[PDB]
Each structure stands twice: as C-alpha cells, then as structure tokens.
Symmetry: D3
Subunit: 167 residues, 6 copies
Amino acid sequence: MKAVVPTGKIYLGSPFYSDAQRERAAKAKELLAKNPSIAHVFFPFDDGFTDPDEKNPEIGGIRSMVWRDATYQNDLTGISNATCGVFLYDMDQLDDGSAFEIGFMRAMHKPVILVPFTEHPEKEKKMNLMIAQGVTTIIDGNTEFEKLADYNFNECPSNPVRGYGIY
Amino acid sequence: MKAVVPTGKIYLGSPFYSDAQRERAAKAKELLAKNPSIAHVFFPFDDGFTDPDEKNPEIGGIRSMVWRDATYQNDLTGISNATCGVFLYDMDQLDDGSAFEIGFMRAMHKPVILVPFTEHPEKEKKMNLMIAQGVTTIIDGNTEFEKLADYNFNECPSNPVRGYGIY
Amino acid sequence: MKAVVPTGKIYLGSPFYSDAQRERAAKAKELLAKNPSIAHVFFPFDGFTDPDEKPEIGGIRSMVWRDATYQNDLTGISNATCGVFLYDMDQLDDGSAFEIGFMRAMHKPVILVPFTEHPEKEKKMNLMIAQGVTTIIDGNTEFEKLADYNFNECPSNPVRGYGIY
Amino acid sequence: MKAVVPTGKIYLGSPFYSDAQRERAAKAKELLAKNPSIAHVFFPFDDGFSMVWRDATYQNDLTGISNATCGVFLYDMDQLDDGSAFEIGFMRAMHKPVILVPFTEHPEKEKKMNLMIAQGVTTIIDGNTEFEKLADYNFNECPSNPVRGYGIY
Amino acid sequence: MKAVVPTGKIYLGSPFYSDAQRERAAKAKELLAKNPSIAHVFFPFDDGFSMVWRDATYQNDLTGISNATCGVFLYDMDQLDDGSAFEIGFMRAMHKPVILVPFTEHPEKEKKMNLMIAQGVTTIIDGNTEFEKLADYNFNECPSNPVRGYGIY
Amino acid sequence: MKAVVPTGKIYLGSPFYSDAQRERAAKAKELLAKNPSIAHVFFPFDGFTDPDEKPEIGGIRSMVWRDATYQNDLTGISNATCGVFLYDMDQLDDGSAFEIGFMRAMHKPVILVPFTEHPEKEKKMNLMIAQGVTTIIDGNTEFEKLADYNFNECPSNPVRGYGIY
C-alpha cells in the first residue's frame, strides 16, 4: 500500500504560550517536515486572523466576536482538511482546547495521534478514559518523540494507550 | 412551539471523584429533575460496567481493555442518545474528559450547555477559545446554577459566552 | 409501528416576511398541531436579543446576534427528527434550501411543502431538492395532510411532475 | 437516570418471510412491546411502498435508522444477511448503539464472528439463550456489553 | 505550513448555461487552474451522465462534495440558486469550509443576505471586486473571512 | 477535471481466507496499481501485534488486538475517498457489508466489484447494497476497468440486472 504521493494531512494540536510548549511544537514541525508520508501540516498558531475593528488586541483578553468566530473556524477548517490529528499533549497542565479537538476529530472518525509529555516521569501515570480510549495511536513525547519523522501518516497504524491508570 | 411531551435528553458531563464535584452533580440532577422540558438525564457515573475477568478493580489504576471499551462506549452511547449536553465545568481544574465530550457533541452539531464553576471569582476570567466558541449556551454555575430547572431543553436557546478573556 | 408516544420532532422552515408567508406558516402550525404523531415543533421566527446591540431587521446585525440566531436554527435542526419546508417556488429562499441540504447531510428526512401562486409557469425544480427531499406534499392542494402525516416513521414520497434543472 | 417517559426508538433489523425469520421478528416485536423504556419500534417490512420502489423502500429504511436511537438486529449466524450488516455499519458510523441478537440452529458448529460485527456492535444479547431480555433491556441508555466467546476473523 | 504538494480539492458550485453564468464558471476554472494550492477541481456540469438520470447526476454531485476538501460557490445574488444553497448547507453539515463568491449586476440595490448563508459560509471573496483572488487563495488551509457589509434577514 | 495530482484514495475491502479470495485481491491490487488517478490504496490484511497475546487466526483474540485491528480498518475508511469491494456473491461477507454501510453513512462513494462463480443461480442482491453502492463494476467480466476508472471523480453507475430482496 505504498503511497504514490504523500497523503497525510496533519492537524498539529498544541498550546503555544509560554516556552517549553512553544519549543515542543517547533521540534514537532521539524520531525514532521522530515516525514515522507506527509502532504501538509496545519498549526493553528502560524497564521492568525486580524479583525480591522479590533483595536489593541491582547491575547488572553477580551476579543471581538468576529475574531473569535474566524479563529475558531480556522481551527475547525484545519481539522476538516486534515486526515489525522497529532497532539503534543501536556500531561502536567491539561489543555481543554486540545481535548476538545481530539473529541471533535474522533466524532468525525479521524485517527488521532497522542504525543504525551511529562516533566515528572516519576509521578503517577494516569489518564482520563475519554482521552485514553479516544486516541487511536500513542507515541510517548518524552522518549519516542522522534518517530513522528517515520510514522506512516498515509495509514496511521493503531497503537492503543496502555500502562496508564484510568479515571 | 410548546412541546406536547418532554423531549430534552440531557448528557450530564462532570468529574465525580472528590467532594464538591460530587456535590455539584447531585444538585444538578435535582434541578434537572424539576425541569418540565426534560425527558431523560444521563450521568456516566450512575451505572458502571463490571468485567468478570477483572479482579480487584481500582479507580485510577490499570483497567481491563474490556472495561475500558464498555465504559467509554456507555458514554458515547449517552452522547448519541442525548439531544443536548450540560457540563458542570470546573474552571479551576480543567477536565479533559469533559472537554473531549464537548467537542464530540459539537462535531455532531448538538447544542452544549456550559455550566462553569469557580471558587476564585476574583481571579482572572479566561477561557480556551475552543470551549468558548464551541459551547452554544452558558449558564454560570456559581450564580445562575438554578436556572437548569427552568431552561427550555426542548429547544435550548443559544447564549454565547462573553466576558471571558480568550486564549 | 404504533408509537407508545409521539416521536415526531419537526423543524418548520420558511420565510416570515410578507403577509402571505406569515399566513402559510400560521396554518402550517395549526395543522401540525393537530397531528398526533408530533411531540414538538420548532419554528425559527418564534428570537435572540443582543444586550449590546443599539437593531433593525434586514439591516447590519451584530455578530453576536448573528451567531446566536444562526445557532438556534442549527440547534432546532439537531433536535428535530425531520424537516418540513414551506417552500415558495416563486421566491426561492436560499436559507430554507441551505437547511434542507444540512438536514439531508445529517441523513434526516425532509418533507417539501411547495407553493406556486403561478400555475401558468411550467413546474420546474432544481436537481438538488428534487433528489434531496424525501417526501413531497403539495401545499396548494395537500396542505391538509400535515395534520395526518405519520412523522413517527416519515413514509417516503419521491418528487415527480417537475422539470428538473 | 429513570426516564420521565419512554425514550428508546428501535430500528429492528431482520431478514423476512424465509421461514423462522418471520417467527423471530414476530416474537421480538412482542418482547419489545412489553418494554417500558421504548417509545417506538420501526420494522422495515411492516409498512410497504423499479428504481422508484427501490429508492423509496431504501429511503424508508434510512429514515427509520435516522429517527432511531438504537438498532436491534435479529442476526442469523447460519446465513449472514448483508442487508443487516450494511445497516449495522451505517448506524455505527452515526455513533448510534447497536444491540446484536445472534441466532444459530447449529451450536455444534464453530462459534465465530466477523471482526467488524464483533467490534462494531456495542451490546450482545444471545437470541437462543436470552431472547426474553429484549423486554427488560433499558433502551433509554443502552448499556454496553461487548461481544466475547466468539472466534474472530 | 507550506504543503509538500497541492492539497486543495474544490467543489465548484454554480448555475449554468443561462447566460453570464457560463462565463463566470469559465473564468473561475481558469483562475483556479492558476492556483498552486489546488490538486483537483470538480464542476457538476462538465462531465455528464428519468429517475435513473436524476439519481446518477445527484449522486455524482454528492460524490464531488464528498471527495472535495472545500466548496467554492459562484453565488448570483440577483437570482438565488437553491441548488447551490442546498450544497452549501450540505458541506457545512460535513464541517467543510465554504468560499462564497457573490455576484450582482445591480450594486445600486440593497446589499442583503440570508442569515444561513452569511453565517454558514466561512470565507467570502467578492466576485465583482476580487474575483482574481481565486488564483492566489491558499486552498491547503482555506483561511476564514466572515461575511460583513450585508444587511441580514 | 484533470487532477493536478492523483487524489483517489481507495479502501480495498475483501475477505482474505481462501486461495480464490487472495487471488482476486492480488489482481485487484495490480489493476488499481496501474490506475493513474490513485494516490493511495489501503488493504486491511497487509497487521497488528499484541505483545501480551500468547495468537490464532479465527480463534479467541485479545480485546487489544481486536480494538487495534478494527480501528486500523476504520482509519483506512476515514482516510479513503472511496471504497472498492471485491464482493463475493456466493459467500456474503458481513464485514465488507458493514464497511459499505459505514462508508455510505459518511457519504463516500462505494464501488461494488461482485463475483459469482455460479452463473446458474438467478442474480439477486439485498436492497441495501443495491441502493447503497454508487457504482458497480462486474468482477467476472469487467475486473479490468479498475485500472482505468477515474477515482478522482468516481462517476456514478447504478446497480441493475439483479433481483432485489
């Protein structure tokens, strides 16, 4: 089933405010860029919509409804265009925006690659059932991050989450 | 458009481990029980699946794949049967399981009622864009919790999230 | 098969500007209200108020009002089991058409109740709509069966007798 | 929680008038009618409507699946019905729960099931052993019950 | 990010052979062909196939919508096409982005749009003012651009 | 309209037990492999390994293997643009049928390539499948066009010449 051309279209989900998270995304892009099976990678934070009537826009502050609708839509559009999702999922500071997108994608029957990260590998290992059962493939970000450059995104082989306590 | 019979089928999403959360759900049920527009309310934590081959099952610990699949499915089945979602959303400790369900439901074009709770009403007021834009109706849990007994679940009038900083 | 309770949940779509439109919708309601297989009926014009909108129908509306109103409609479509469209064949309403496509994409049954006021012109209909709708009830002569139609099962009734384009 | 009123809307999928099958569907209808959690039950063969007949009947079935909240399939394991299988897959794609009720007149034979069906269905109720359960099953919530005990291919 | 290859698959929705319309679709095809982000463009009237013709043609269009990644509609504001509107609603229900390209030969008249269309579409590109943009628009990501400047009803 | 790149993404569904089945699928691949409108082809039997499964085909499989395998198939269906089913009319495969229904619910085009090995029996076909499939290519005499069929657009081709049941 070798692809004649790359067909993997990635929706790269991830927070992007403070460092560490911004760094993860950076390397993620690099790895995916090196992957032969990828045709396109979409990252919600690259572009950005500008609402002419919105003065002194501040991130985290009150935003115009026009900016909100267009930005939210850009993300749903990215999910729509994608064939699969890749989420740089911080296990230390759960991101509800990412979890929402994971559920939205699974509702559309799309495969979802979870790439969990933790700075406390010695602390408890537990995951919410919806995330644990919702994702179709798990790739540890702390010790297997680099396989994003080799994973066959044309078919996304499944790999159930295991080894995590579930609640 | 008065309903001839109750048609609202609620999927009540909410964490249910430690107190406070368990208490919120309790009162939520009571309010919904008093609502004339509700035909059924589903709460994932009421029943529970038992896997005969699973000995000494512990919540938060390793669970059998059979238990995981059946429990996860019970929840998706609840979402499928529901006409709308009601989420007792802890703004202090974001729950990714709930966020996942919100996204799954919105992917199915179903209305979602967000009922946010916060023990720090004086701290910053901010919400993730996906949640803020994804939900169709917001009812403050801290000061408007009781309108769950009167909200017309037969039609779920929209009420966009506003007053929250967005990130 | 004999509903132990009405299960029909109608999304009633139709324009609501002119006296004519308001009329058809008024009778539509009365009829459906007599149908025993209906548990609920939703009509988009029965509204949202944007506290921060200093508003004029047909004018520039706030994005908040637009989002809330558009959603109330999608919400009615989500909740509904089937759609009933008072389709004016003389003044094609793209809002209604949009909704018909939305509902069909969701695989829900759609009942088209067309009106023409101009019998002289050849009865034509766009391909999408002719093929998209699952049941047609002529409004000019069959408007009455909306009170008898079994919305618990929504029997099929292909569109015929219309030039397709 | 306890439903303020019957919420379950069943799409009863089953082959017909080919001996026994007609009997199965018959008893099933009776059992379901005794169930307090059901608001409505649809059976593609009760009511009835060339490419015109085909489309209308096909559509009448998709409409039944659309209005339905869950699917119940009197699944004959001795003669696989692709119509029912198509419908099971259609309902699962819509995220709707599916109750499989397998029947076999040959228990002496291998006990096997296609993976898509075994994993696709959310609840199994054996037709030869617990057919009567259709009258007690809570269709307002359709509790899951994974398929087990079947060799899979 | 920059696509390793054209990813956009356009479903071009437009009325046909009714004067002007044929011209619009014509130029649109040329503009899209110049777009480096497009992998494929489907136009319901190019290729062509009674209830047999109806079903086949209808289906050929739903198949085009299915394979499509986005929708581009040459929307005539002077004569509302319910076919295109049906398709816009169908694509939005599938969560696919829709580019609306409105055209009007009467700018002196009121500027109004039905709410379902104004809110349903995700990106607007005026046909009279910026038709040429179809050649530059990045169809690999379909950036949103909400409808504004239209009275809504 | 002349794809600036192949866009066809086929989900090839079919049983893979007997020599006959393995054959049809083998030729199916070779054919599709010659088609220039295909960008990718997915065949479910090309597998998952459960590290904790001490395994026998057709036997009791671990739930982990079942979930992973079932998902790889749904994943192939999600990624695909259309389905191609080598449908054995003599030994109806409910797994393939399930997938055909799943794909149609997603509104994707489905190409049925039936085989019969028993021309003597009247050509019959279940209603769902006859109406569900969007294009039929006889495998006993038209197997070859899978190498020419334009999967970029997937031209429709209604099922006819089969007793419906």
